Design a protein around this ligand. Structure first.
Ligand SMILES: Nc1ncnc2c1ncn2[C@@H]1O[C@H](CSCC[C@H](N)C(=O)O)[C@@H](O)[C@H]1O
Ligand SMILES: Nc1ncnc2c1ncn2[C@@H]1O[C@H](CSCC[C@H](N)C(=O)O)[C@@H](O)[C@H]1O
Ligand SMILES: [Mg+2]
Ligand SMILES: [Mg+2]
Lengths: 240, 239
């Protein structure tokens, strides 16, 4: 209730890889040398923030950048911005005329990263909307034409609500476009029907992801690839 | 020379934190999406002496997804074994897609060939039985700019990836992808020394540490090292 925290949360310090040494090797060898100076800055100030556990990591970021470039994405939607690491990643990867619709309930987080976005010279690509994501997506469904469908969506907002996001995004991303769901392995806790001692919010997210992973594997509208990078990323490609 | 598969130390090591997590991914997200003929090919390969070299099913779906997202049409596969990643590629490509597939050992390919045929995609594949570098070098002297590959999957002799790279950054189009398989070498690349390895395993481990450093510094490409399977490094040609 009234009072003032993130180790009432149980999964903060876990990782899906076998050792922290392997993760550090990947980051130091392959990610940090390829990370834009302004992503480095954004990440380092986020690492001191209360919710740094939620930050998209740098090896995952370079993978998002790679996918965006390989598929020649130009119009994207970013749901769950936090301090803007995945958003700046996207903005740097897109061509100069790329356009991003960015949605987050808490703009104060975004203002932490916004100076780095500005210095990188890519703020002009970003339309930031401070809102719960689902009302925005529902309004887009009434607004958008087939000419305006998105090439790519990155989904990283309310971890209990991805299935509802998916029902909108399979209509807002073009045929052949990509929807990426972040955190679909939820620190490994999805591997069991029951799991001990999580925060109620973490447990709701865990069950949501177990149900989402099963549903997406069964969903004829997409083909999928669940990738054990970061905390699990499920790539979906719209078939019809 | 004077001095086998069951001599390797690392074969059963996971890069994920538990076998249960890996099995979850495979049972939930990979096997339900694996083509019947890929399942059949995997099952016979699991029984083979060199099953440890098999590309796993979750990695397969990731390769397939990359191929479709980038609209690849012409590809090269280096290191075929029984054909799992080759069949993945051939199913992913359009009906008129084409693959150049190179392996020193066609007998391995013939294990998977019946499944490739039943999948109806053998016509996309030009299988060359040879060491890869002589083929790649002959391609360099014949390749026309308009025939450059969209995508290359590199999974052959581990100690030789750096030599393959020097050819492939010229054989794949600008904006095209070169994927190197096994770049985390079961996690053993994470340390300067790693006891208990077969001599060939240690050669590969050192080759990958050098390669990973080299690729991260190579201005001809952008890269992303992905902790899927045994590590896959995606390269994108810049010039
Ligand atoms: N219903 C909702 N709609 C939109 N954003 C939400 C939301 N519920 C939570 N969020 C936001 O989702 C974010 C999750 S963390 C996002 C991390 C970010 N992608 C990165 O690159 O690091 C938080 O910023 C939180 O404010
Ligand atoms: N110098 C060389 N040139 C071409 N192929 C080679 C080679 N050295 C080893 N190989 C081949 O590389 C393969 C490595 S295993 C490849 C696994 C396969 N990509 C899969 O999807 O499962 C073996 O079939 C081996 O015969
Ligand atoms: Mg996330
Ligand atoms: Mg391999």
């Amino acid at each position: 209730g009234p009072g003032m925290s993130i180790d009432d949360y149980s999964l903060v310090h876990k990782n899906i890889l076998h050792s922290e040494d392997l993760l550090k090797y990947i980051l130091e060898t392959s990610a940090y040398p390829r990370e834009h100076e302004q992503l480095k800055g954004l990440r380092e100030v986020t690492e001191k923030h209360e919710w740094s556990s939620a930050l998209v990591p740098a090896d995952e970021g370079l993978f998002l950048s790679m996918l965006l470039k390989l598929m020649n994405a130009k119009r994207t939607i970013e749901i769950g911005v936090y301090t803007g690491y995945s958003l700046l990643t996207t903005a740097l990867a897109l061509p100069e005329d790329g356009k991003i619709t960015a949605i987050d309930v808490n703009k104060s987080y975004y203002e932490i990263g916004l100076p780095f976005i500005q210095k990188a010279g890519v703020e002009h690509k970003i339309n930031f909307i401070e809102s719960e994501a689902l009302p925005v997506l529902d309004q887009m469904l009434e607004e958008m034409k087939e000419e305006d469908l998105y090439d790519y969506a990155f989904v990283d907002a309310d971890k209990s609500n991805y299935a509802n996001y998916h029902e909108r995004l399979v209509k807002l991303v073009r045929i052949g476009g990509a929807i990426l769901y972040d955190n679909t392995l939820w620190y490994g806790s999805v591997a069991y029907p029951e799991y001990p001692g999580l925060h109620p919010e973490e447990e709701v997210a865990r069950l949501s992801f177990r149900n989402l992973n099963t549903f997406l594997a069964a969903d004829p509208r997409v083909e999928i690839s669940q990738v054990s990078i970061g905390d699990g990323v499920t790539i979906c490609r719209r078939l019809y």
